[PDB]
Design a binder for this molecule. Structure first.
Ligand SMILES: COc1ccc(-c2ccc(Sc3ccccc3[C@H](CCC(=O)O)C(=O)O)cc2)cc1
Ligand SMILES: [Ca+2]
Ligand SMILES: [Ca+2]
Ligand SMILES: [Ca+2]
Ligand SMILES: [Zn+2]
Ligand SMILES: [Zn+2]
Length: 158
């Protein structure tokens, strides 16, 4: 795709849901993950109910329509495409995971979404183990962003 979005007013569409959590809980988890990135960039994130959205969000299993199949429980948790038109920018979550707040059983939808949205904005992986963009999932209740995450996003967006 591209290295960055060329506009600042990003839109997102939650195309479908997992039944693992109430819709309002899923909506809020995504809103909080977006707010992590909007706080540190000139970007804004606005929810729309439209196929025209920049970031289309889906939950799916196995081969789910893009040629990059999920793998069942664990392993690949989600993936996202770098910015651009069409499928670019979109973020997909493997519903063979149990989505939760992450503290007890399951994976944190908030933390996975925050990492995926980083990719959807153009970030690659960090080499800082504590960073949100490190390649390995990690549960935390503390602040997810490391200096390296902010440095990476500011490098793209100012
Ligand atoms: C607090 O700190 C955190 C740090 C990292 C994470 C975290 C990491 C990884 C994933 S998902 C994943 C898992 C295993 C292999 C590949 C992927 C896809 C790559 C898919 C592909 O390239 O085909 C990817 O890295 O996005 C989600 C969340 C969360 C919190
Ligand atoms: Ca898109
Ligand atoms: Ca999986
Ligand atoms: Ca599930
Ligand atoms: Zn996909
Ligand atoms: Zn990643």
């Amino acid at each position: 795709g591209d290295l960055k979005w060329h506009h600042h007013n990003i839109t997102y569409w939650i195309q479908n849901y997992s039944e693992d959590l109430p819709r309002a809980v899923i909506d809020d988890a995504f809103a909080r993950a977006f707010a992590l990135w909007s706080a540190v960039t000139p970007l804004t994130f606005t929810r729309v109910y439209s196929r025209d959205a920049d970031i289309v969000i889906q939950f799916g299993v196995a081969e789910h329509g893009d040629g990059y199949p999920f793998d069942g429980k664990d392993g690949l948790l989600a993936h996202a495409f770098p910015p651009g038109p069409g499928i670019q920018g979109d973020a997909h979550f493997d519903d063979d995971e149990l989505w939760s707040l992450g503290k007890g059983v399951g994976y944190s939808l908030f933390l996975v979404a925050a990492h995926q949205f980083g990719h959807a904005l153009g970030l690659d992986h960090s080499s800082v183990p504590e960073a949100l963009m490190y390649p390995m999932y990690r549960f935390t209740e503390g602040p997810p962003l490391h200096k390296d995450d902010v440095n990476g996003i500011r490098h793209l967006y100012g």
